[PDB]
Design a protein around this ligand. Structure first.
Ligand SMILES: CN1C(=O)c2c3c(c(O)c(=O)n2[C@]12CC[C@@H]1C[C@@]12CO)C(=O)N(Cc1ccc(F)c(Cl)c1)CC3
Ligand SMILES: CN1C(=O)c2c3c(c(O)c(=O)n2[C@]12CC[C@@H]1C[C@@]12CO)C(=O)N(Cc1ccc(F)c(Cl)c1)CC3
Ligand SMILES: [Mg+2]
Ligand SMILES: [Mg+2]
Ligand SMILES: [Mg+2]
Ligand SMILES: [Mg+2]
Ligand SMILES: [Mg+2]
Ligand SMILES: [Mg+2]
Ligand SMILES: [Zn+2]
Ligand SMILES: [Zn+2]
Lengths: 368, 184, 368, 184
DNA sequence: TGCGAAATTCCATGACA
DNA sequence: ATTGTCATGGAATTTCGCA
DNA sequence: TGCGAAATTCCATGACA
DNA sequence: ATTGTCATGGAATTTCGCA
């Protein structure tokens, strides 16, 4: 815009240019003596190219791009133009890291009854023990009661074999698992349908969603580690020992063991509780029904100083699962279709696929 | 005297030899005395080692104060006596040729033998794969004397697999003829 | 102690046993009717074995071990005996995680002059580019001015070749690096001695100590990533471009580029600053000496709610560097010989070797 | 007129052919006009490609506003003209057969040629490895006219390698005899 | 002597694998 | 015998333009 | 009706690779 | 078409034993 800069040299006011400054012509270009020093005022038609040239030197953010521009030029609302370029730079949007934390975690309600929901997962590969490399961990959501199965692979065939032994005791309403090959197979879906079990899947690459079982994996590995100190890692024979030990371990916050929450009475194990000895099984089951309802439940923690919670229509970016060397950590922007809860969202990428993802695997696209 | 509780007494016994299924010939039957809950384990023999291998799986879930059995070789062995002593389990035997359990247990063991016979007929070599469904059926069977099924008494909740369709358990004239055909 | 329990059954007071309770004899053992229920009081000579039996079921901590014991027994100050056993259990001490955070980080003073201290490190392996897999990064501590060198390996030979090209410009007083094979070799020590350069090494497995260069590695990889979007990862030819781009990038907090801090004047690059055009080189160097002294310096942040700071004589445990599967994450206790600063310490393990370690790689041994 | 600054003008020239050292035969000499700072690069030839390869290393540290040279083929080529235009570098040439730089630069180039000659004598095939020490010596050499060395003027600090021992630079009767022996 | 807007400064967030 | 660092973009705070 | 000590409860820390 | 969890051991707080 050379017509815009023409009236300026003359001396009449233009919206955005402070009238208290001296706008002259020198070396064939419009200049202004500013407190910082003499700067060139480029015509509006040149500004986009200037911002892009400065930004492209090192793909700098707002202030670092501005500081370069400001060395030579001045124009009204320079950062508005810098931010407009930052918001259009695909390389910056997909490579830069987020600086906004996810909103506070949800503490999903504890399943009401034993067998309402099982959390399943695999531990491994572990050092070989009798040809076995993996452990299928099955944690009952209400009680925390765990079943352990040694496997040669994290497969559907091994999961089905293990769960047919477990389901001889009782059948769960739901089986929650991550999106591992063993659990997402059509053969596993078919196995569950046959039994009336609903399969629930965690959002991709979010093990916190399977937190109930993940946390038990920690305890299983910790005990196996302790029992194998200064001995070869022959864990196979220890699985039944670890299962029984953990199922009979008190949770200091609950003041109950997973066994007690499942049966309301201790079996013949060391230090069995004898407090319901004079009660009848019915009186004991009545007290168990009361204990199961009054267990402590944690609540969502405070949001951090700079958290973000999803909004329908918002431009958001999914995290690249296994990013290759020197490749962006983020996918191209997507739009939030449905907000399932403040931590789970349905997105539509540029491809056109609907993905249910955790907000931990998303960043809000910068500069709107 | 204190009231009867789950894990106070487990009644164990062997069923078999049965037609081979996945290389298995026997079924070790474990019944909790109080609740009437049944755990079934296929074995290749009624030996102390097969009893110990199977019971090591059960005792990784729950240990009984007492195990009751007849005077079968597998249960009277010094090896089985050592295994129990190690777990603080008292072994209890019935007098030879006089098998006494309890009304609830005797009745339960009858249902087990009859339900196995009913389902064997037609597919006598496919029972290994049926053991989980046999157990669910048995444990979700209503007890006329206690008002609750073994699942309810053990967990204190209703099951997700109620067995409303109370089947015959008695062999049909067709199943009787198909059963007598196998006995050849 | 059966003599101790004898006077109790009679009825005379014993220090530790509340006199308001009924201490009787039943089934050949001393019992007490407590609010919780009737508990067996074992003789002092049996207690250690009881605590050890309860603890060993699942190698439980204080409360979980206590809750088991309390099911059958009662005795004065039970937790004192539980904690005495927890403090003697080698398997728990070396396997359990710490629950005390390290003290707040130090913000070491910025080197006073360019060439006072160089921070060196390797980036790689990267996708092969002209047979090159690694990048030797040399960051001047004062200015932040970086030199980049492509290498085929993170070796002494490649480091020496690169630094002989760099040291043609100027020789540094100190070269700070981590304990990588390339820098700890006798050949490298010899190379530095020959030139009067002092070698300074970070504590083991603590890249934060090399933070100055680590942080530049982030910027180098970020720019390489951006420039290679939708192109094959041919980074070799981009190293000179990345070096020049980053050395001429403004730090928004300082409002200076590494080039400006090193030379006090911009070279012929885009958007060169022209503010010292009318000053003489001497006037310009005088202003540069003033800029270099007034740069912003961060201060140590607040300590977290539950941090720990080392003390001479304290029993502490070093973190296992590469712990194998099902093996403890901690070494056996060591003693703190010298507290170099609140974040660095000299320890003496059970072997008898003196190790200078970061407090981030230590946990204070539990239960004294 | 504005005061003289570092990076305002780089004076470039080739020294050689020299005896081969690590396959190298020439030295491209770059001298900053203001400070007198010297950068030396070994090349296998005085070609445009060798000039571009070497200057690509220097211009990754600092770009001059002007490059001054004589009318040597490597510097007058259209390829070298294109390379400079790309970096916003103005090429400046002296008139053929009339090489004019500056007092400070002419004096500096004399020191370079003489220091190289002094150190070549005895080890004429080991100069490649000596280029870093030659540069440090030259850049830490006190300027009688400016009161500061090229290192001080470029960085505005003292160096960690001061060159207090101001050596002869003139060839000894022994070095003169050893030099005339090589000329055979 | 105070208003609205632009400019600057602050600073949590996250990654150097 | 040593030790974290700093680009980033919303928010908070200060300064600017005008009166 | 209040003291000192023991017991219980709280809760940051860190790991499920 | 879903969602973090909880053992751990010092510190903070409540309860106990006695008066
Ligand atoms: C791609 N992927 C993983 O990387 C992975 C993990 C884990 C899995 O169980 C798991 O199945 N997977 C798979 C492999 C098999 C299947 C595709 C997968 C499903 O994501 C896993 O437990 N960890 C450990 C962990 C780290 C941090 C945490 F907060 C928690 Cl709670 C746990 C984290 C990595
Ligand atoms: C054993 N080891 C490493 O694991 C390692 C790292 C790194 C090295 O530079 C490095 O040299 N090493 C070596 C390999 C070569 C030599 C033995 C080593 C010295 O420790 C490294 O940069 N990262 C990235 C990183 C993670 C977290 C951070 F806070 C920071 Cl500041 C940086 C962390 C891992
Ligand atoms: Mg998994
Ligand atoms: Mg997992
Ligand atoms: Mg019999
Ligand atoms: Mg390194
Ligand atoms: Mg590093
Ligand atoms: Mg010449
Ligand atoms: Zn960009
Ligand atoms: Zn332990």
């Amino acid at each position: 815009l050379d017509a815009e800069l023409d009236q300026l040299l003359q001396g009449h006011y233009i919206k955005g240019y402070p009238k208290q400054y001296t706008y002259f012509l020198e070396d064939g270009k419009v200049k202004v003596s500013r407190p910082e020093g003499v700067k060139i005022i480029p015509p509006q038609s040149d500004r986009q190219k200037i911002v892009l040239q400065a930004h492209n030197l090192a793909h700098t953010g707002r202030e670092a791009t501005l500081l370069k521009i400001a060395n030579l030029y001045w124009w009204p609302n320079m950062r508005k133009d810098v931010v407009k370029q930052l918001g259009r730079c695909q390389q910056c949007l997909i490579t830069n890291a987020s600086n906004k934390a996810s909103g506070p975690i949800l503490r999903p309600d504890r399943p009401q009854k034993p067998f309402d929901k099982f959390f399943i997962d695999y531990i491994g590969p572990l050092p070989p023990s009798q040809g076995y490399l993996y452990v299928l961990v099955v944690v009952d959501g209400m009680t925390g009661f765990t079943w352990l199965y040694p496997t040669k692979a994290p497969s559907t065939s091994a999961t089905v074999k293990s769960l047919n032994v477990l389901t001889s005791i009782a059948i769960p309403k739901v089986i929650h698992s991550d999106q591992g090959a063993a659990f997402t197979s059509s053969t596993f879906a078919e196995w569950a349908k046959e039994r009336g079990i609903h399969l629930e899947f965690s959002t991709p690459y979010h093990p916190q969603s399977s937190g109930k079982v993940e946390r038990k994996n920690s305890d299983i590995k910790r005990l196996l580690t302790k029992l194998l100190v200064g001995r070869p890692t022959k864990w196979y024979d220890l699985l039944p020992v670890v299962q029984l030990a953990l199922n009979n371990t008190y949770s200091p916050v609950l003041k109950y063991t997973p066994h007690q929450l499942l049966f309301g009475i201790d079996s013949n194990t060391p230090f069995a509780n004898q407090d319901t000895l004079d009660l009848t099984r019915e009186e004991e089951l009545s007290l168990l029904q009361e204990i199961r309802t009054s267990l402590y439940h944690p609540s969502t923690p405070p949001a951090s100083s700079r958290s973000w919670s999803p909004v329908v229509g918002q431009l958001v970016q999914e995290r690249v699962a296994r990013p290759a060397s020197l490749r962006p950590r983020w996918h191209k922007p997507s739009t939030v279709l449905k907000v399932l809860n403040p931590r789970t969202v349905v997105i539509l990428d540029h491809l056109g696929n609907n993905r249910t993802v955790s907000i931990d695997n998303l960043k809000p696209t910068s500069h709107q | 005297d204190r009231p009867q509780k789950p894990f106070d007494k487990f009644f164990i016994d062997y069923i078999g030899p049965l037609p081979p299924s996945q290389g298995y010939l026997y079924v070790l039957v474990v019944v909790d005395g109080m609740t009437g809950f049944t755990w079934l384990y296929p074995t290749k023999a009624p030996s102390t080692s097969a009893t110990v291998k199977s019971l090591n799986v059960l005792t990784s879930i729950a240990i009984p104060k007492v195990i009751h059995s007849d005077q079968g070789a597998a249960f009277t062995s010094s090896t089985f006596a050592e295994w129990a002593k190690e777990r603080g389990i008292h072994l209890e035997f019935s007098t030879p040729y006089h098998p006494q359990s309890s009304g609830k247990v005797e009745r339960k063991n009858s249902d087990i033998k009859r339900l196995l016979t009913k389902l064997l007929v037609g597919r006598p070599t496919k029972w290994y794969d049926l053991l989980p469904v046999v157990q669910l059926a048995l444990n979700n069977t209503y007890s006329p004397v206690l008002k609750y099924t073994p699942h309810q008494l053990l967990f204190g909740i209703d099951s997700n697999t109620p067995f409303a369709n109370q089947d015959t358990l008695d062999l049909t004239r067709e199943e009787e003829l198909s059963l007598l055909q196998e006995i050849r």
